């Protein structure tokens, strides 16, 4: 079986443009984009943990990695969404 991010990309699409569809090739580009940014952030965090002689990747390493990778407004908005998600997650 082959795993994809397609159904979640579609969930967010209907969440943000309810009457808008998406062609299959565009969805494949979206899945490649998600996998790409995933590998970039995860690799940046991995290196971050290595440089500080640490064995665990916390949400903190993910945050610093995001600040390293994303430009500016994207970085702060994404940091915001992430820390919001972790706080709302640990409150339950």
């Amino acid at each position: 079986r082959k795993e994809s991010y397609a159904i979640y990309v579609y969930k967010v699409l209907k969440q943000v443009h309810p009457d808008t569809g998406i062609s299959s090739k565009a969805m494949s580009i979206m899945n490649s984009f998600v996998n790409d940014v995933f590998e970039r952030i995860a690799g940046e965090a991995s290196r971050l943990a290595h440089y500080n002689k640490r064995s665990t990747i916390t949400s903190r390493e993910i945050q610093t990695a995001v600040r390293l990778l994303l430009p500016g407004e994207l970085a702060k908005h994404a940091v915001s969404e992430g820390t919001k998600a972790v706080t709302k997650y640990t409150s339950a």
């Binding site: 979640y8 967010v12 443009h17 808008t20 998600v34 665990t56 990747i57 916390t58 709302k88």
Partner: protein
């Protein structure tokens, strides 16, 4: 009971992101918070991209997003263009741009 995505109020998978971080050998261990933060950042980025792309689709009177709409969205946003500066979208074309040197008269 409820998916960890719902615990973080997220559409993107928390369990899957945790498993892929688990198998990427990025470190020996990953804390419980990291996958929900990463899923949140990913969902945000896809949300921004799909937003701008949706705008580009409506501008050309189109119901569904095709690759060109993604290319216009990325290349017209300074931030996302910077993020995807070394990425090629297939069947995306280029921005309409004639150098103001060989124009009329």
């Amino acid at each position: 009971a409820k998916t960890r995505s719902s615990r973080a109020g997220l559409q993107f998978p928390v369990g899957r992101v945790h498993r892929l971080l688990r198998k990427g050998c990025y470190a020996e261990r990953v804390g419980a918070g990291a996958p929900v933060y990463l899923a949140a950042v990913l969902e945000y980025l896809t949300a921004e991209i799909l937003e701008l792309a949706g705008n580009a689709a409506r501008d050309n009177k189109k119901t569904r997003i095709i690759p060109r709409h993604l290319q216009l969205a990325v290349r017209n946003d300074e931030e996302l263009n910077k993020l995807l500066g070394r990425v090629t979208i297939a069947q995306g074309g280029v921005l309409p741009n004639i150098q103001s040197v060989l124009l009329p008269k």
